[PDB]
Amino acid sequence: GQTGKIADYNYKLPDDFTGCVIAWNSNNLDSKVGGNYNYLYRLFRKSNLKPFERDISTEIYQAGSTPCNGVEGFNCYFPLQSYGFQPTNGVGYQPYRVV
């Protein structure tokens, strides 16, 4: 669980979770300079999510009592954001694959 975007709006680790996790740096092999098209944020959730569930449904986030009908502008902010990474960052910004 912990805090942050991980396990709150991203994939949530269940309570009393059993299993291993392996993380490794991904400087190359489908990680090039500039902002790649994929690999975007999953934020702006009204709930705290549930263990083991996958959220595939994307929708305009609600920032007010009245919800918009498909127009972007005041409120109705985007719940996603691309990762502005690059293979020329430091140690804390390089892409990392977690399985």
């Epitope: 090039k32 954001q81 691309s82």
Partner: antibody, heavy 126, light 107 residues
């Protein structure tokens, strides 16, 4: 949109050249630019790039250290400085624009070519 | 440096003939490729962006598909106006290096 280039020369043996390409019909300050050459009958080559803000400029292995690029948003026009000219520098230089793809509100550059100008053929002799 | 080869060299096909152009990159450049159609005396025009998508204004006949090492540009119908050359473009990292190019003839 309309890309116009100028700065041709009958002969430029080891001389100074100031090529100029202008961008009109689209925002000059919101896009990066490329200088892409082409040999007289051969394939396509790239010699110089300029970033959106002018901070990042990169050249080829045999082009870096001798040629220069620059841009100006007041006139919406950009320039190429050509020095240390040999007899094998005859080519057809073009001034082109990148592709800015919007994903989740973020603009991605340095992905391809969209608009090409007429181009200017620069030749050298002895 | 990244070196890429475009095949074949020169073939002839007209009217209802399907042609395939293969683009093999030394490194795995993922879905980062653009296919252009440069006329013999005109500036190149982009036909494929993102190596899988089709640029707006390009006819639907041209198709592109591939990833990593291998890419493919397929044309089912060659109407007598595509008499030009086709080029790839790799942009994973600087510098930019282009291939030889493929030319099509009319039978």
């Amino acid at each position: 949109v309309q890309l116009v280039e100028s700065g041709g020369g009958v002969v430029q043996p080891g001389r100074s050249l100031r090529l100029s390409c202008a961008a009109s019909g689209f925002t000059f300050s919101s896009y990066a630019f490329h200088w892409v050459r082409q040999a007289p009958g051969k394939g396509l080559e790239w010699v110089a790039v300029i970033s959106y803000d002018g901070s990042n400029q990169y050249y080829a292995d045999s082009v870096k250290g001798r040629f220069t690029i620059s841009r100006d948003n007041s006139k919406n026009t950009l320039y190429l400085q050509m020095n240390s000219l040999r007899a094998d520098d005859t080519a057809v230089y073009y001034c082109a624009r990148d592709l800015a793809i919007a994903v989740a509100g973020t603009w991605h550059y340095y992905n391809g070519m969209d608009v090409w100008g007429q181009g200017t053929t620069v030749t050298v002799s002895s | 440096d990244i070196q890429m080869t475009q095949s074949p060299s020169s073939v002839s096909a007209s009217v209802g003939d399907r042609v395939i152009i293969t683009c093999r990159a030394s490194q795995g450049i993922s879905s980062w490729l653009a296919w252009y159609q440069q006329k013999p005396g005109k500036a190149p025009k982009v036909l494929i962006y993102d190596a899988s998508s089709l640029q707006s204004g390009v006819p639907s006949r041209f198709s592109g598909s591939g990833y990593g090492t291998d890419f493919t540009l397929t044309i089912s119908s060659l109407q007598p106006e595509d008499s030009a050359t086709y080029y790839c473009q790799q942009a994973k990292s600087f510098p930019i290096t282009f291939g030889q190019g493929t030319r099509l003839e009319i039978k």
